[PDB]
């Protein structure tokens, strides 16, 4: 429907449907437990996750942007690091939240 | 330019608060931004070809759905790491212009002080 990068996951159109199953491959997303995958932006903690997502400006501002041609197409590559605010009183909760979702697929039945 | 108060990832660069001010000088280093010619650097989202760049920026949902996310703890703090690739549309008539525009900005900093 939308280009992948503009899709918004919800219960009606979930993370697996929008972005593919989570897995170890370089082309796959690795982020989200079963609850987040099932619900996308309907997830109870979506606001606390979304606080880390870049604005279009920040995405093109902060990131190392590349262009690669592979057999499947031409790709805009991006890499970056976003510093958590360790002064933020919720820092400890933000670490626990990200810990619950990074590579959670490894524990799925 | 009260824009400076927002966390780095929520900043919006404009003529009043440019890419350098919001996101640091472009450069080659591992977590230094490399994107933008002199014109985009000075204008941010006022750049008159911004919409044709922003079409490739991810939604929050796509950012956490598409990307490889990691977390690092270092002497500087805790960092959310991210890598990913966004496919351009080979079948879109505007594809060649899209490639020309992104190539205009990738590592453009190399050609000026």
Q: How far is A60 from chain B (nearest CA, A)?
A: 6
Q: How far is B95 from chain A (nearest CA, A)?
A: 10
Cβ atoms of residues B26 and B33 within 8 Å: yes
A81 and B84: CB-CB below 8 Å?
no
Domain membership of residue A62 as a residue range:
1-109
Q: Which residues pair with B35 in a beta bridge?
A: B106
Phi, psi (rounded to 5 degrees) for A93: -70, -40
Distance CA(B48)–CA(B32), nearest Å, equals: 24
Distance CA(A7)–CA(B9), nearest Å, equals: 19
Question: Smallest Cα–Cα separation from B108: which of A65, A56, A78, A79?
Answer: A65
A52 and B88: CB-CB below 8 Å?
no
Q: Cβ contacts (< 8 Å) between A19 and chain B: which residues?
A: 62, 65-66
DSSP assigned state of B31: T
Expt. technique: X-ray
Cβ atoms of residues A81 and B79 within 8 Å: yes
Q: Could you tell me if A107 lies within 8 Å of chain B, comparing CB atoms? A: no
Domain count, chain A: 1
3-62 of B, contacting A, C-beta below 8 A: 7-13, 19, 22-23, 30-36, 44-45, 53-62
The tokens of A66 are what?
Answer: 């590349």
Torsion-angle region of B67 (φ positive above 0: left; ψ -120 to 50: alpha; else: beta):
beta
Reported structure resolution in angstroms: 2.0
CA distances in angstroms from A43 to A55, B56, B70, listed in the order given: 20, 25, 20
Question: Smallest Cα–Cα separation from A67: which of B13, B104, B111?
Answer: B104
SS3 A65: strand
Question: Smallest Cα–Cα separation from A63: which of B27, B74, B70, B68?
Answer: B27
Distance CA(A34)–CA(A105), nearest Å, equals: 8
- Specify burial of residue A69 (Cβ count, 10 A radius: 0-12, 13-18, 19+): exposed
The tokens of B36 are what?
Answer: 């933008």
SS3 B11: coil
Q: Which residues pair with A29 in a beta bridge?
A: none
Distance CA(B30)–CA(B44), nearest Å, equals: 22
Q: How far is A94 from chain B (nearest CA, A)?
A: 11
Residue A80: its H or E element: strand A73-83
Distance CA(B5)–CA(B1), nearest Å, equals: 9
Of A59, A61, A98, the CB nearest to B22: A61
């Amino acid at each position: 429907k939308k280009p992948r990068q503009k899709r918004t996951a919800t219960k009606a159109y979930n993370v697996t449907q929008a972005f593919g199953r989570r897995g170890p491959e370089q082309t796959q997303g690795n982020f989200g437990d079963q609850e987040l995958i099932r619900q996308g932006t309907d997830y109870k903690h979506w606001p606390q996750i979304a606080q880390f997502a870049p604005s279009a400006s920040a995405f093109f501002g902060m990131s190392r942007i590349g262009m690669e041609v592979t057999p499947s197409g031409t790709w805009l590559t991006y890499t970056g690091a976003i510093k958590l605010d360790d002064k933020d009183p919720n820092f400890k909760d933000q670490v626990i939240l990200l810990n619950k979702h990074i590579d959670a697929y490894k524990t799925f039945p």
